[PDB]
Structures are given as structure tokens and as C-alpha cells.
Amino acid sequence: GCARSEGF
Amino acid sequence: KPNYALKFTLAGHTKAVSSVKFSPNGEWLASSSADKLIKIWGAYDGKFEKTISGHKLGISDVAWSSDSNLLVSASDDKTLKIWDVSSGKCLKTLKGHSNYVFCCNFNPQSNLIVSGSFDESVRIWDVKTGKCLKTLPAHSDPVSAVHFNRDGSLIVSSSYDGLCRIWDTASGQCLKTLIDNPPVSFVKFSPNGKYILAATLDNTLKLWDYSKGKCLKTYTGHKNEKYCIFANFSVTGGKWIVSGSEDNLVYIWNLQTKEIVQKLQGHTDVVISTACHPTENIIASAALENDKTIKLWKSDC
């Protein structure tokens, strides 16, 4: 995972 | 109206793609992924060229130097990395962010790198030495995008705190704050540097005049409520606004009239990233974990 693919 | 048609689908990332960028010489597409990898593909034939590795965690953003010879990547391992594209070797590891690095960009000279992080700061780095030159307490929430203007004298940043901010690069001082507070998920300068395109998480893109601080245009019809989705000015043919969308579509608007002129279908998950080729009417799009692929589209105008 990566912060962009996680979202919110 | 444009007529973008699918030409290539680029597979190989094993997790969600996070960002795609064309090299300034128009020859390459670079993609970063949650799979901790950067992949380099041919822009015109979609041919896989190489994989670049070394980050311990996923990568949220990637950017090219002006001469197309270097990449900078932003990663969850809290570092940025400067890579020689030709050799694929990591030239520098830029340490100092205390949380995930979300966004990165070279300045036009490409002696500087700007980064934004979940630690709510913006950092300015010397490319040659890897040292942090400045840390700007830019925001009160994670920084979603950072971008240099056409001469590199200005940096524009956006954040979940709802603010767009324009910083004087040389001094690090804030020159302007756009507040007119929905979370801002993406921001970038227009090619001439006079305008700023900002995405907010209320399914809205807005075109602002920087020097006047006025919203000139509003573009709607797409779904953008959760993810930081790239948007672009398309200038090679007609003047379009291009963006990914959470309904798995690529949206293309007429910039002046704000009307949707095309919707590209084919992705099976959120189109997190779109990029416009520097000279050809070519769009690259990239999607999240359920899709994992990049798509190249070509238009006659």
C-alpha cells in the first residue's frame, strides 16, 4: 500500500 | 471535441498505481506504485523498459528532471529518492520527513526538489547534495500536492486542511493563501504560470487566477471524494482539463466553456492518475488495486 492508494 | 482512443494497456505493477508522468523529452512514461516500484515504459509503443527498486514501502508520486535523466520518488518509508534513469541506481536518499512523503517535483532548473508529506510540511531539497535546504510549516494536515511554476520562483501546495498556498521559493515565505474549506486533494500551476488548478474532495475542480485570487472556472460531473487524483492542462491540441475519477473514467473538459467533451472508459478501478504528453495528443491514465494497469490514449486533436 501507499498513502495515495489508501486515500481519505 | 477530442477523440482519445485506447492504444496500449501497460501491465506489470502488482499493487495500485499511484502516479504516472511523461518524461519532458516526450519519450518515456514513468509510473510509481504501492508495490514499492517505479516502472519505465516507452511513451509511443507502450513497451516496458525497466523496473527501478529500492524503496522499502509504497511510492505515492514520481517526477522527472527537465533533461529527462533523473527521477525523484516519494515513498511511505518517509524518504524521497533520486534515481539515474539510465542506470536505475539510487543517487540520493532524501531524509527528514517524519511521515509518509506524498508528492514531489523538480523545479525547471532541476537543481531543487520540492516535496510534501503527511507530516504537514513542505521541504525543499538540493538535488546535487541531497540536503534539505528548507522546511516550510506549510499546512495543518497532510500535504497532497506540490508544484513549481514555470521559472521555479514559486511553489504551490495543497492540503487536506482546505488551503492552497503559494510560497516564494528563495525565501520560503508564504506569498498567498487561497481560502475561498473542502479538502484540497491536488494543485498545480498552469503552463504559463498565471493560473492554478485545484481539486477539492467535493467532486470539484477549480481554475484560479493566482495574481487576482479569483476562481475563474469550475469543472464538475466527475466523482472525486476520497482520493488525491491528478489533474492536467492539455495544451498540445485543444485546451482541455484532464482528470481521473472515482467512477473509473477519465474526464476531459473544455477549459474555457467547462463542458465535458470526453469520458474515457476501460479502467476497472479509480483512475488515480492522468498525465498529458508534452508534444503529442497522448494521455496516460492509471488506476488502483483492482485494475493495476496503465492505459495510453491518443487523439487527433
Numbering used by the authors:
A (entry chain B): 1745 to 1752
B (entry chain A): 32 to 211, 214 to 334
Sentences from the paper on this structure:
pmcWDR5, a well-established core scaffolding protein found in histone methyltransferase complexes MLL1-4 and SET1A/B, was initially characterized as an epigenetic histone “writer” to recognize histone H3 lysine 4 (H3K4) and is essential for H3K4 di- and tri-methylation (H3K4me2 and H3K4me3) to activate gene transcription. Two separate and non-overlapping sites located on opposite surfaces of WDR5 mediate most of its interactions with binding partners: an arginine-bearing cavity located on the surface known as the WDR5-interacting (WIN) site, and a shallow cleft on the opposite side referred to as the WDR5-binding (WBM) site. In mice, methyl-CpG binding domain 3 isoform C (MBD3C) interacts specifically with the histone H3 binding protein WD repeat-containing protein 5 (WDR5) and forms the WDR5-MBD3C/Norde complex. The residues Val31-Cys334 of WDR5 are visible and consist of seven WD40 repeats that form a seven-bladed β-propeller structure.
Structural analysis of various WIN motif-containing peptides bound to WDR5, we found that the WIN motif of SET1B (1745GCARSEGFYT1754) is the only one featuring an ′′Arg-X-X-X-Phe′′ pattern, as MBD3C does. To better understand the binding mechanism of WDR5-MBD3C, we set out to determine the crystal structure of the WIN motif of SET1B (residues 1745–1754) in complex with WDR5 at 2.40 Å resolution. Structural alignment revealed that SET1B interacts with WDR5 in a manner distinct from MBD3C, which is mainly located at the C-terminal region of peptides. In the structure of WDR5-SET1B, acidic residue Glu1750 is unable to form salt bridges with WDR5 Asp107, unlike MBD3C Arg45. Instead of forming hydrogen bonds with water molecules, the Glu1750 carbonyl is flipped in the opposite direction and generates a hydrogen bond with the ε-NH2 group of WDR5 Lys259. In comparison to water molecules in WDR5-MBD3C, two water molecules adjacent to WDR5 Cys261 in WDR5-SET1B move and generate a hydrogen bond network with WDR5 Tyr191, which is further stabilized by the hydrogen-bonding interaction of WDR5 Tyr191 with Cys261. The most significant structural difference lies in the ∼91° rotation of WDR5 Tyr191 from the MBD3C-bound state to SET1B-bound state. Consequently, the hydrophobic B site formed by the rotation of Tyr191 in WDR5 is closed in WDR5-SET1B, and the side chain of SET1B Phe1752 is oriented towards the solution, thus making minimal contribution to the interaction with WDR5. Although SET1B contains a similar ′′Arg-X-X-X-Phe ′′ motif, our data has confirmed that SET1B does not induce the formation of the WDR5 Tyr191-related B site. In contrast, in both the apo- and SET1B-bound forms of WDR5, Tyr191 undergoes a rotation towards Cys261, resulting in the closure of the pocket formed by the residues surrounding WDR5 Cys261.
